[PDB]
Curated annotation (Swiss-Prot), chains A, B:
Substrate binds at residues 288-299, 371-376. This is Phenylethylamine oxidase. Keywords: Copper, Disulfide bond, Metal-binding, Oxidoreductase, TPQ. It catalyses: a primary methyl amine + O2 + H2O = an aldehyde + H2O2 + NH4(+); 2-phenylethylamine + O2 + H2O = 2-phenylacetaldehyde + H2O2 + NH4(+). Induction: By phenethylamine.
Amino acid sequence: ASPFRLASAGEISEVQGILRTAGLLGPEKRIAYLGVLDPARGAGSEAEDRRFRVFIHDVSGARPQEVTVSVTNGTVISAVELDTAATGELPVLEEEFEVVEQLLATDERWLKALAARNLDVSKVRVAPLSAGVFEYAEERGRRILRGLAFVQDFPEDSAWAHPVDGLVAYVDVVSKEVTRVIDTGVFPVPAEHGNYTDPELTGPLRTTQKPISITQPEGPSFTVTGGNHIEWEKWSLDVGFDVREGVVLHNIAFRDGDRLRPIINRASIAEMVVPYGDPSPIRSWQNYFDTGEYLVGQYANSLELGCDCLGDITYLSPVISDAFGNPREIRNGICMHEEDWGILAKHSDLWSGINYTRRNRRMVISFFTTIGNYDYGFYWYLYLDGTIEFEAKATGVVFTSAFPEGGSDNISQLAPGLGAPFHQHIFSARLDMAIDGFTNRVEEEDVVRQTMGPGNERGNAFSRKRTVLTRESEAVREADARTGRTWIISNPESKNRLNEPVGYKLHAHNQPTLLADPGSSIARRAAFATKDLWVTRYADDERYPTGDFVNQHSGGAGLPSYIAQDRDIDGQDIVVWHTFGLTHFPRVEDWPIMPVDTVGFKLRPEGFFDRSPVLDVPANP
Amino acid sequence: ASPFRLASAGEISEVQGILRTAGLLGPEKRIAYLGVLDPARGAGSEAEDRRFRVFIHDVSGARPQEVTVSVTNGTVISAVELDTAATGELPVLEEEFEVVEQLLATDERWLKALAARNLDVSKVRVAPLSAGVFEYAEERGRRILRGLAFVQDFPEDSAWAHPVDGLVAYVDVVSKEVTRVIDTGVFPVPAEHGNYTDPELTGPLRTTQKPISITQPEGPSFTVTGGNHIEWEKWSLDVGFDVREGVVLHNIAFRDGDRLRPIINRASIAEMVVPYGDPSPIRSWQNYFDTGEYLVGQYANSLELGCDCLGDITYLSPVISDAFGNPREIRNGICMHEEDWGILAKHSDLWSGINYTRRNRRMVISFFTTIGNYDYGFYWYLYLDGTIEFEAKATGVVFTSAFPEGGSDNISQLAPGLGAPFHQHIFSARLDMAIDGFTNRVEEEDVVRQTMGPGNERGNAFSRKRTVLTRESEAVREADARTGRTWIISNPESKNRLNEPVGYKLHAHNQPTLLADPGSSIARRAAFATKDLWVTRYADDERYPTGDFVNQHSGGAGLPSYIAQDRDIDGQDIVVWHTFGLTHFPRVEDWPIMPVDTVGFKLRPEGFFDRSPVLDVPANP
Ligand SMILES: [Cu+2]
Ligand SMILES: [Cu+2]
Ligand code: NA
Ligand code: NA
């Protein structure tokens, strides 16, 4: 059995049983995170050791625990009580969905605020908003959620149309107490509805769209074996799924002739955060770590055939644990399919008389998640030519506020009285590299302009420079779009037939990084987001750029701590962490439901192959 | 009849007849350019006036002419003799394809160079390479082409595999004389073949690709009327075709409710140039203005169904003039089709219980051209949400040289002894704007970082700033990817329902601009390419960023001259010229035939609509 197979329902039940028998899962315990661990380095040989990591909350007020279990051997490997004021709180629990609203509904201060606004408490929705770390000393070591009110006029109404500005509250979800209710003043609650299925707002539906049918009469060109092992057009990989990260890719490799050549050992989105840029005290604390605080895999959607994924689709239905250790399937949570991708290569040669055209295609592995108002599609693509790409598709409903009567430098107007605070959506891709194996290095490549003069008398020359990042202290890099900056991951011990090291080049989109002041709480908690590229030496326990327990963790954790080790990364087992994101000034067109916008990155072979790897693609039928 | 209809065969024959009768097209004349002119402003009412512009070369040595004809009235409007030393030479003629090779084959200096290298002259290919303007005084006012040798071992061999470095020659294609033969020394001619249809090099063809079938059982959702008028999913436009520019889009507009709202009056790629960065005197003069010197529409490919354009395709077959004024059809030269484009909008709402997904699609209008070794696909896309995008797909065979034995700062290695000089492919999109009509302005928008302090005590705030470009002297702009710089075209006299000016935002890729020294010939002849964005006041005669006659024109022409007029562009009829390109350090994977790489730009609505314009899209079948 592949050590990279998806977790099965029986493994999760086994973890439950092991924890129970060890005294670690009594009736007061709640599993906040559970996932299989990847195999250790050099473990390929041999014998199963499937281990699971578990974060266990306690509803009675006792300290939570981090536990690793061997499901293979039926044993607890390690169990440690956590001091959450030091190392962070556990991820938000599903069962907290309604707790903030419930607590607030019986609080006299909350009710006073609602009564001033003539709002029916039974119509007021409130979400479990993550709290971060600000100036409130009573919150240190306590599990806090914050709450913002949105009115639902009727049960199928979009509450996002009706934000209640000027009001925020903080609660403790263990003691079930409301710690603070803050009312800065009454803003009109926007009146118009945002019901995008109401014919009054949609108008008559278009009747002009004729069907576009995508079929594969012979079935798909990829195979799936062992549950999650993909073979497609020379590519080989395993599709993992983790409740925190979502879809993970393992063992990305390319079969070049008779050799299986590794490229990336593990690819994931290891963090994603949505920092808000509105200085109103109602929202200035808000930074949603969709991955680290909420767990994006947990909220993966079940994808509808013909709707979410069109064509000949092979689904995976990954299994996760509920809060009690029972397995729960996400039916049709991962789509896998190949897509036509236009022209691959084309040339019409006058001298030879040969006219040549070939088509491209890509393998797609995707999932979609919903976190509150946001919905995101995460797409990995493998192309015939060896290119690897990630794309995020951001949609949903925008997070709303009042639009201030005098206008705003930090909020845009969507509808009468309705605002959208500015924000970013910033991702970190963790790419545990294995270019032709684990001995890798990274070079920063810039274009080099040359001065007109001796050796360049016509002033046309230009060049390139590559700078090796030799130690972690040198490996925190920023974009430079003007100079075409990219980063090449190579294997200095593996040369192509031209005696040049094999490599892959990372092409970033060069979007803005974290805009917050560098002294802010968010700049400290999401330090990764302040720089485009980090390179670390691989270590088993360095998994997330924000650290293991993000919720209410004070600044400092993750990448900035890991690189202090100043380890050798010049021809070693290394990990690239690429920050990329969208900066969103919401437009009227984003209301009442947002069209998709996109961001991502790609890696292209750079002297990895001895010539084009797609010369054996046949002409299209 | 629409004044924007494609030229017909009969119109071209009529132009021929008119020129003949006027004494302007005797047997020594050759048409180097012919195309319909767009209607004048305010001409919509009324009555036909189809005018054609013609550049007429004379093979006997007499001066060429620029002529405008009214095909409607059977008259010559203007005819002027050109002084080519002043205003530039005419575009390269098709009949010059073989002239450089032919001349050189009987030249003793050329033959001496070939004999030293043991090369059979009958196997030596040479192209009509554009000459530019360098230090050779004898070339001023003369029609010159330069020639580089490539060996074809047999008639179906790819000559690009066998460049003959150290050798270049210059000819006069009117006097049929070889002016210079320069031999800097013998380089080995690379030996390996680059025959990408030879089984020895391809290997056995893959048998693993299963069909991907794209069909439309009810036909397409767009209609074509009047030959070239498209109606699709609220969009309206006319598809033009010009021998120089290729596919042009006219009258791009969007039907918002019962109002046809203009967006872009004319969109084209008005120039494209390929500057080379190798300071060897063998190539340091080379800059191929594929559009302005060669005419990309002229070399548009005939596109094969199921191969080049997949799905339900509607073709146009545009007509151009041959060198004698006879019409020539480019059969199946333009593809039009709609494509599925993934998720348009999606949200799963816990509070309302509504789960909503809609799919996106795009209208595609494309052509493919071949210029020597290069092949480019030009794609325009219209999306359901109002986004407009252009994408160029660059492929073909890379232009080769020897790889110097000591390595090179300006050439990369492709195969043993085979090099690829560094170069860029730089496009200029000319967007004659009409956002809700012709009264438009441009603002540069940057993100604004804010300092932690009073009014921003948590250091989270960020903002945006917009600066109006009020006069042409202020409207030559550069990218700033780090600050998320974009440019918004708005109509200051047309407000959306929120009392904000309607607009569209240009999103650039922020790739490097022209790298050459600013004092070089190429920086002066392709000045447009040195800056990302220019805004001019519309004028009928300001068509190309490089001017009308690019071939052998000294530096200065086009945009830098036009903006000296310093015209008012604040709420006026304006034109945006966006420079964008690829910087290519060729990789081993690009040999022997290059996979596609891409560059482009998009424009997204920015408060153009009163809410999302896709709320009336129905759920997918
Ligand atoms: Cu957003
Ligand atoms: Cu190129
Ligand atoms: Na690694
Ligand atoms: Na205009």
